[PDB]
Write a protein that binds this ligand. Structure first.
Ligand SMILES: *[C@@H](O)[C@H](CC(C)C)NC(=O)[C@H](CC(C)C)NC(=O)[C@H](CC(C)C)NC(=O)OCc1ccccc1
Ligand SMILES: *[C@@H](O)[C@H](CC(C)C)NC(=O)[C@H](CC(C)C)NC(=O)[C@H](CC(C)C)NC(=O)OCc1ccccc1
Ligand SMILES: *[C@@H](O)[C@H](CC(C)C)NC(=O)[C@H](CC(C)C)NC(=O)[C@H](CC(C)C)NC(=O)OCc1ccccc1
Ligand SMILES: [Cl-]
Ligand SMILES: [Cl-]
Ligand SMILES: [Mg+2]
Ligand SMILES: [Mg+2]
Ligand SMILES: [Mg+2]
Ligand SMILES: [Mg+2]
Ligand SMILES: [Mg+2]
Ligand SMILES: [Mg+2]
Ligand SMILES: [Mg+2]
Lengths: 195, 212, 204, 226, 233, 222, 196, 196, 195
């Protein structure tokens, strides 16, 4: 289970993603960044089958970067999420589907609002205040159902996120080797180097 | 199904939901997942309804026979082990049971045993069992402290079931609360989720995922 | 495994006196896990309303598809599509995927702008039309909805009465289904006004 | 489903019940199983409902275009040939079981079509889950040189046998009569022996009974001027 | 658990004003092979009961022996064996129904479908069904196998409910049964033309008719049927 | 391979009143798409003012009822003709069902009668013996159609008092026997319309302090 | 199904029962299994009704087009077209066909085409599920250069027994006579052939 | 295997081929399938060689013990013992047996016992894989009260055809004649019966 | 994978056993002691299928305690291991076999030698200087092949054991929630409360 979490607060979106890469019986790496910057104000985390995850993320990244150059304009998070959903919805009826689940965290510069989209490998899109893929949601959703507000600050969002990670580290069976946390706001994307 | 039980300063809190399902069909919203074995013993029910009901009422008969023969009450350890040894005989036959045997005695103090149809018997301070265990664990674990008040502890257990009733499709209906002390168990009422959810949302300011 | 019951959800439609009503729950889940309580399943193209139950990706995909087709229809025909015509378009569009179908249960509702006649219809996942006078049901609690509608429904109900009947049919059916609920929306549709109401229901 | 076809003196009659089912549940209590391929060629369908409708409309469409091309009224053997070759190509995966009947310049005709592409000729036929109940009636009461009135009676009686004795069939009886030298008469709900009795109680609720959170007007109209 | 080998097809029956009628063909099939052409599948018990059996014939012969042994055992130390304490249809049925449900519960069923037809001491008509699963039910008309699908509809046109029984004479009922047997010969691929029929009347007693044949069949219209569609010649 | 189970269809319904109780069931018996009988009784008077029905696989249902009737008989022999209370009957039936836990009676069982305070009682069972006292319960083929209607019209669920708008619920006023039979008849009439295994006839058994009474009503035969 | 074709002095006779089944239900008791692919080239059909109809329709098309270009085709030629269809589509077909025709040069000829798509030219042929029960009877009773009346009796007696023992066979006995005189259709009802 | 038993005026004759196979290999081409359970009660064996031997050995034991206590058993009695074994052990047996015997009171009797374990008393009986091909021939050619020489010819001609068409049947034709005169064994070789 | 390790040094045997009990997706307990004292100088750790493990351990414990009372004498570790092996060898051909793997660490008071026996659920016994069950051995055996001596002290044995646990915590995918360590020597059995 490749833990990926997301929380949308007052003025930003926070994505947390596990660092472990386990192939069989061995943890091959404990510092893996399961995310790609699609545009300056849009970040996508991902989790699923080996190989497919990175291949899909980089493919999406390339397409959005192509759009940005062509139009000299950044697509809204809503527009990027719809593009991503269609690719997955197309993929599910292919010969060999992309087995990838994603969270898209973005800051809409037009509306001055943070936005979090959860999309699974079938192409099921939902906009949420907080989201998760895989087994993480079984612990974190109910926990966030209790501790979330729409008017929370970024610092309160991080404390709330620490609470989620602590619960996961206590009750989940695999060692996912901690998480890399990234914040998406009006100023762009930045990584929290100490978590 | 969501059931929990945890040890704290004022004894034990036991909280359960009330839903029973058959596939996606909600068969009952008013089932009793706590069994009053004796004035100081409680049993929780998760998994097969019949299996849990039948063998835990059977357990009460065995505990009663113990105190007739030994002129002394049965320990929580001995009671839990009667049930675990029984299901171990049936192992492989297809019984489906996830139970907590909660109680108090003088020599043990407040005690909780997790008993399983796989034969697993575990002593511990906190347990959540059923299809909604993960959801209850999330709330319970993040707000648990050893020094809660009988009032705060009762609420936490109630709140943890509510959390799971909300997110878990196969849990819901209502919340049955119990509190176990030196002097036995004490019922703390049936709490319909249809009213409790909105009450908690308003008073606590949580559940912002919902349109209200 | 069964695509039609992974996400869960329900839709119901009813006719009344010079009016129609269409309603849906708000849940979206991954089997036991509830994910979203704002996943509306009813869409509208002009004055024609479409509810869709089943696999959520296909629900989204089909809405986008029928928005596409109805917009082109309007540009070419220079008029909004009617429910009878739209019903045939849904049937056609589903059957072209006969051996690779969308796992959905669509429901059309609306009033003919010219004749003023109330109209509802339902389909299976591959296109078969169920044009009923009284009511149409779809979703994981369809059995429950059939029982509620069949007992509660009476013909020629006034808009404000029809609202109560359909809302109670949905609510009590949803409460007997694990994969339905988490909120509900009801549309009351008249020839030149449409009211949308969000219902208060139990959140478990 | 119960569908039948009966030949008579100067034409042919087909009939069907009006129950539509999804497993043990009745989806539609007044389904129309009698389809029109051309004005004087009608067919009744059993099996997969979407398949019987789609295959009927397709062949009906191509029959119309053929009729226009040839400046001739369509023949039943043409519809029969086009249907069977289509169904055969799809190896039974299109679950359409049809009774095709009609009149044309050649005369009156009655055929059945199986989903794998086999056709059969007959004076009396029955298809669907109630075909055995219907065929028992047809085998008991059918005779040569039936009148129009006798054939309609026999057909509807055969459908009734399915309605009462088969759980897959029920509700009403539809009929279509195709006589030579005449317009075909479609008799929708020819019989209505299954009207629901009055309910003991009215379930009309007091206004305000349902709890509401939000109200809002929905904008169905286009973008306005000024 | 087994599979049936040599099998008997439909058994049909109905009540009428003064009694019951039951019938079954004389065939023992071996799959698609119409192997044995002289098999009696109606077995009388006393002068007031007839058991009609379909399904596996080896199991039928076993049941035949159980009933024969039942008569023997009932006569033991019973001075009223041919009078007040004679075997009733209700007794014989419940015995079989007990055996059938016991055998299915051991996962070793008697692969049969049985109809017990008879008249009770008080003149009441008895007609009840039981099969390999131990499932039982009663109705004015009863039929097994293909008869359930084709005969019941025809017999229910004569006796649609309980109130139609006193209105139904023995001539009308026998006519309906014989017609139904013809229809089954037209349409059941494991039926024979030859059959046996039994009447149990409260006044005239047990009338057992053997070596009956399906007659007055309609085949002449076959000559006019040519090809499968377009073939004129 | 031999399949020891079957499905005979049918639907049953138990409602408990303040001083009475009803147990209704349709009289149709089926296999697959055929009708076996239009009138085959499914609800039985078991003695001691207790009525019972075991719906699903009829062979198992008949066996269970037969065994429980036998249990009542031996309860009188063994305990000086003592009346078997409804709660004691329910517990006895649990053990009958759980005794075949690993080769179950494939039925939904419901019993009805009066408790020891004279109030109406209904008990509901799963196939392997889990039971619960309830005010209302439908069982069998069309149970999914009927139960939601009963939640609404018997326990006034999702119903509120006009003017208050969702604040105050509809009060739980008791139902008379005449009002209950109306709900039963409408429940079965509705179930007959939309479920193919339901129809032919409706037989209701009403239980009061005075004894066990029967009422029969016709249902659509299609 | 019970089908057969028998060559005799004046030509060839095709014979068949009239039963079509779905399991044990007789879907059609008056079926016509003797089908025409050319004026004096007919075939007997066994196996799948759909497959054999589709094949026979295609063969009739090929021989109609053959006739337009090259004149009347031989019976051997018709059997070759049947074979080509049955052999090349053997994985997807369940068709046992007997081809029988009359030339003036070659007279009566019979070709049988079993499941594989092989061709076998024979004096007479039997096929269908009911044929198994009359291998002994037909082998003992067949003679070359029989008369029309003798050949009709041979087919009638043979199919009578096939119908008697095979549940999948029954109804009427249809026959098609192919000679220089023309094409004669015959029919024999149960009351006639059962008492033989 | 092709086996048959035929009653006639003076008694009954049993007949059988001599082929035993393992797939397509003939493990024994001179098998004796006509086996004795009592002086004038014999049986024809088909199906599993092991099962039918074990059964016949047990029956012979039961009838030997019957004879010691109650005197000569009837043919019906012998068939009942076969039935009891075949019926009660139907799940584990593959045995198709024809029982044939001669009493002075009852004369020639034939009982056939197919797979299920049912019993059928008949004027004549046929069984084995090769019997399928002679249902038509035997039904048409059997008569009641035939002579010894006619019955031998009937069996010889019937099994000849069964052998001709069935690959599992072949070798010599063995026959056992049961009359008041005694027990006669007959044998007929390929060169004799193939040319029939 | 229920990590159980064992190392035999100069004058003692050290057993290390994981604390986690994971049932499905949740870690139900993080302080579980997977061991039973069979006699004052004999300790058995165990791992396998749920229920069977404890049932088997306690059954063996009862039998050895019975022997001790009857004879007023402690069985040698070799004798106890042979008894345990026979029970498992008997078990493997039963209707429902015990699915339990064990390590038996004991100090023989007669020979004044520590002894470590590794026995799997089939009844396969081997005496070893160091042993492990399940996937733990895939990491630890080769590591101990490099760092072990027969003349090591108990303190050196514990440092060597810390090295094994650190490697397991780095490369294994599940969080086994640390280990409980117990030492068996001439003075009996004691638990290392800080590890
Ligand atoms: C939640 O764990 C809850 C606790 C019970 C004490 C109510 N259990 C269930 O809801 C359980 C589903 C579990 C296993 C996921 N449901 C049942 O046990 C169910 C209860 C009845 C009252 C609906 N019974 C059931 O499914 O029957 C078993 C059965 C089915 C068919 C044939 C034989 C036996
Ligand atoms: C006798 O052999 C007869 C000859 C036909 C040419 C009339 N065949 C049948 O009756 C045949 C038997 C089956 C077992 C091959 N039945 C059918 O072909 C049947 C007819 C329809 C009208 C019911 N079709 C059928 O069962 O479809 C399925 C199928 C498809 C392909 C191959 C076999 C069966
Ligand atoms: C012809 O039916 C003949 C009659 C015997 C009584 C001689 N049977 C066989 O030849 C028989 C055919 C098989 C398919 C049933 N072959 C055997 O029985 C064969 C004989 C041995 C000596 C090779 N045995 C055999 O194949 O053993 C396996 C087996 C076991 C049980 C049932 C069938 C087959
Ligand atoms: Cl055909
Ligand atoms: Cl041998
Ligand atoms: Mg999702
Ligand atoms: Mg829930
Ligand atoms: Mg719900
Ligand atoms: Mg009905
Ligand atoms: Mg026949
Ligand atoms: Mg053989
Ligand atoms: Mg080992």
């Amino acid at each position: 289970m490749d833990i990926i979490l997301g929380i949308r607060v007052q003025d930003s979106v926070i994505l947390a993603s596990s660092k472990a890469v386990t192939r069989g019986i061995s943890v091959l790496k404990d510092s893996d960044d399961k995310t790609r910057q699609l545009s300056p104000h849009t970040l996508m985390s991902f989790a699923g089958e080996a190989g497919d995850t990175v291949q899909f993320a980089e493919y999406i990244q390339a397409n959005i970067q192509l759009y940005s150059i062509r139009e000299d304009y950044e697509l809204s998070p809503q527009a990027v999420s719809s593009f991503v959903r269609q690719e997955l919805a197309k993929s599910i009826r292919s010969r060999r589907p992309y087995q990838v689940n994603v969270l898209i965290g973005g800051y809409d510069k037009k509306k001055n609002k943070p936005e979090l989209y959860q999309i699974d490998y079938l192409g099921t899109k939902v906009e949420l205040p907080y989201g998760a893929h895989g087994y993480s949601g079984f612990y974190t959703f109910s926990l966030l159902d209790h501790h979330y507000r729409p008017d929370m600050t970024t610092e309160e969002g991080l404390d709330l996120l620490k609470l989620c990670v602590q619960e996961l580290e206590k009750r989940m069976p695999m060692d996912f080797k901690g998480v890399i946390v990234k914040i998406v706001d009006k100023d762009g994307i930045r990584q929290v180097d100490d978590f | 199904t969501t059931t929990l039980a945890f040890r704290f300063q004022g004894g034990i809190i036991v909280a359960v939901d009330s839903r029973a399902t058959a596939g996606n069909w909600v068969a009952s919203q008013t089932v009793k997942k706590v069994i009053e074995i004796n004035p100081f013993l409680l049993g929780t029910m998760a998994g097969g309804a019949a299996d849990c009901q039948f063998w835990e009422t059977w357990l009460g008969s065995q505990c009663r026979l113990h105190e007739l023969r030994e002129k002394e009450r049965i320990s929580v350890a001995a009671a839990s082990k009667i049930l675990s040894n029984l299901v171990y005989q049936y192992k492989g036959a297809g019984l489906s049971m996830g139970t907590m045997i909660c109680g108090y005695t003088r020599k043990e103090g407040p005690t909780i045993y997790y008993v399983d149809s796989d034969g697993t018997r575990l002593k511990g301070d906190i347990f959540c069992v059923g299809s909604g265990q993960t959801f209850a664990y999330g709330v319970l674990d993040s707000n648990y402290k050893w020094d809660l008040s009988v009032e705060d502890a009762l609420y936490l257990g109630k709140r943890s079931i509510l959390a799971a009733a909300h997110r878990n499709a196969y849990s819901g209906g209502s919340v049955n609360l119990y509190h176990v002390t030196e002097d036995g168990w004490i019922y703390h009422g049936n709490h319909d989720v249809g009213e409790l959810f909105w009450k908690v949302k308003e008073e606590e300011g949580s559940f912002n995922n919902v349109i209200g | 495994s069964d695509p039609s019951s992974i996400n869960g959800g329900i839709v119901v439609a009813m006719t009344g006196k010079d009016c129609v009503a269409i309603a849906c729950d708000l849940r979206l889940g991954s089997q036991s896990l509830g994910v979203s309580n704002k996943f509306e399943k009813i869409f509208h193209y002009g004055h024609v309303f479409l509810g869709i139950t089943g696999l959520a990706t296909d629900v989204t995909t089909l809405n986008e598809m029928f928005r596409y087709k109805t917009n082109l229809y309007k540009l070419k025909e220079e008029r909004a599509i009617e429910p009878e015509t739209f019903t045939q378009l849904v049937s056609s569009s589903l059957y072209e995927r006969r051996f690779g179908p969308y796992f959905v249960g669509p429901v059309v509702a609306g009033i003919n702008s010219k004749s003023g006649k109330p109209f509802i219809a339902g389909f299976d996942l591959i296109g078969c039309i169920d044009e009923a006078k009284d009511f149409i049901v779809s979703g994981t609690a369809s059995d429950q909805l059939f029982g509620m509608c069949e007992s509660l429904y009476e013909p020629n109900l006034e808009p404000e009465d029809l609202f109560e009947t359909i809302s109670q049919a949905l609510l009590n059916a949803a409460d007997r289904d694990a994969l339905s609920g988490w909120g509900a929306v009801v549309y009351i549709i008249k020839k030149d006004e449409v009211v949308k109401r969000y219902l208060k229901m139990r959140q478990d | 489903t119960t569908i039948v076809g009966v030949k008579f003196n100067n034409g042919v009659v087909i009939a069907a019940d009006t129950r539509s089912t999804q497993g043990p549940i009745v989806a539609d209590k007044n389904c129309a199983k009698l389809h029109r391929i051309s004005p004087k060629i009608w067919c009744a369908g059993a099996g997969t409902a979407a398949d019987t409708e789609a295959v009927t409309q397709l062949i009906g469409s191509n029959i119309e275009l053929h009729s226009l091309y040839t400046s001739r009224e369509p023949r039943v053997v043409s519809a029969l040939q086009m249907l069977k070759q289509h169904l055969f190509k799809y190896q039974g995966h299109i679950g359409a079981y049809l009774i095709v009947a009609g009149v044309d310049p050649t005369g009156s005709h009655l055929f059945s079509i199986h989903a794998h592409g086999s056709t059969d000729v007959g004076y009396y036929l029955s298809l669907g889950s109630g075909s055995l109940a219907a065929m028992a009636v047809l085998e008991s009461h059918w005779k040569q040189d039936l009148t129009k009135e006798e054939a309609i009676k026999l057909a509807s009686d055969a459908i009734q046998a399915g309605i009462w004795n088969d759980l897959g069939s029920g509700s009403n009886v539809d009929v279509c009569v195709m006589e030579i030298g005449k317009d075909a008469e479609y008799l929708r709900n020819y019989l209505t022996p299954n009207v629901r009795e009055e309910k003991q109680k009215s379930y009309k609720f007091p206004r305000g009974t349902t709890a509401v959170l939000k109200e809002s007007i929905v904008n169905i109209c286009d973008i306005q001027e000024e | 658990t087994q599979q049936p080998i040599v099998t008997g097809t439909s058994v049909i029956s109905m009540k009428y004003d003064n009694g019951v009628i039951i019938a079954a063909d004389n065939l023992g099939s071996y799959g698609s092979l119409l192997r044995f052409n002289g098999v009696e599948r109606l077995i009388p018990v006393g002068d007031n009961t007839v058991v009609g059996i379909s399904g596996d014939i080896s199991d039928m012969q076993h049941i035949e022996r159980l009933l024969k042994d039942l008569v023997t055992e009932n006569a033991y130390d019973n001075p009223l064996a041919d009078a007040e304490e004679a075997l009733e249809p209700s007794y014989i049925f419940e015995y079989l129904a007990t055996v059938m449900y016991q055998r299915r519960s051991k996962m070793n069923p008697l692969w049969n479908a049985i109809i017990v037809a008879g008249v009770q001491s008080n003149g009441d008509q008895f007609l009840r069904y039981v099969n390999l699963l131990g499932v039982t039910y009663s109705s004015p008309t009863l039929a097994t196998g293909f008869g359930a699908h084709m005969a019941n509809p025809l017999l229910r046109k004569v006796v649609d409910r309980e109130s139609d029984i006193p209105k139904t004479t023995v001539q009308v009922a026998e006519e309906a049964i014989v017609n139904a047997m013809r229809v089954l010969y037209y349409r059941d691929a494991r039926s024979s033309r030859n059959f046996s029929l039994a009447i149990i009347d409260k006044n005239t007693g047990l009338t057992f008719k053997k070596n009956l044949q399906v007659e007055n069949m309609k085949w002449d219209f076959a000559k006019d049927i040519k090809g499968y569609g377009t073939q004129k010649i | 391979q031999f399949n020891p189970y079957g499905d005979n269809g049918g639907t049953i319904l138990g409602i408990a009143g303040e001083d009475f109780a009803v147990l209704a069931g349709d009289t149709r018996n089926i296999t697959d798409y055929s009708i076996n009988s239009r009138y085959e009784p499914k609800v039985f008077d078991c003695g001691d003012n207790i009525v019972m029905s075991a719906n699903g696989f009829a062979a198992d249902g008949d066996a269970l009822v037969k065994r429980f009737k036998n249990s009542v008989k031996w309860y009188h022999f063994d305990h000086n003709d003592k009346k078997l209370s409804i709660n004691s009957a329910a517990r006895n039936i649990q053990h009958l069902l759980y005794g075949k836990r690993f080769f179950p009676y494939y039925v939904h069982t419901i019993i009805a009668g009066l408790d020891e305070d004279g109030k109406g009682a209904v008990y509901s069972f799963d196939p392997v013996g889990s039971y619960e006292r309830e005010q209302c319960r439908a069982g069998g083929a069309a149970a999914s159609l009927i139960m939601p209607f009963l939640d609404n019209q018997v326990n006034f669920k999702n119903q509120y008092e006009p003017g208050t708008n969702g604040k105050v619920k509809k009060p739980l006023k008791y139902l008379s026997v005449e009002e209950v039979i109306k709900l039963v008849r409408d429940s079965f009439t509705s179930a007959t319309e939309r479920h193919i295994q339901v129809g032919d006839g409706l037989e209701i058994l009403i239980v009061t302090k005075d004894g066990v009474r029967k009422e029969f009503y016709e249902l659509k035969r299609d | 199904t019970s089908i057969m074709a028998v060559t005799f002095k004046d030509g060839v006779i095709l014979g068949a029962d009239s039963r079509t089944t779905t399991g044990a239900y007789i879907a059609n008791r008056v079926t016509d299994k003797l089908t025409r692919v050319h004026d004096k080239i007919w075939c007997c059909r066994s196996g799948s009704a759909a497959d054999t109809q589709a094949i026979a329709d295609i063969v009739q098309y090929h021989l109609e087009l053959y006739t337009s270009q090259y004149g009347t085709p031989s019976t051997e030629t018709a059997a070759s077209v049947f074979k080509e269809l049955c052999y090349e589509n053997k994985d997807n077909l369940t068709a046992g066909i007997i081809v029988a025709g009359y030339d003036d040069k070659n007279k009566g000829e019979v070709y049988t085409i079993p499941l594989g798509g092989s061709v076998h030219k024979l004096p007479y042929a039997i096929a269908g599920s009911g044929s198994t029960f009359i291998y002994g009877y037909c082998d003992k009773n067949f003679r070359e250069n029989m008369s029309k009346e003798e050949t009709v009796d041979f087919i009638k007696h043979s199919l009578s027994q096939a119908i008697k023992w095979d549940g999948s066979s029954g109804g009427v006995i249809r026959m098609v006579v192919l000679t220089a005189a023309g094409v004669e259709r015959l029919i024999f009802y149960p009351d006639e052939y059962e008492q033989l």
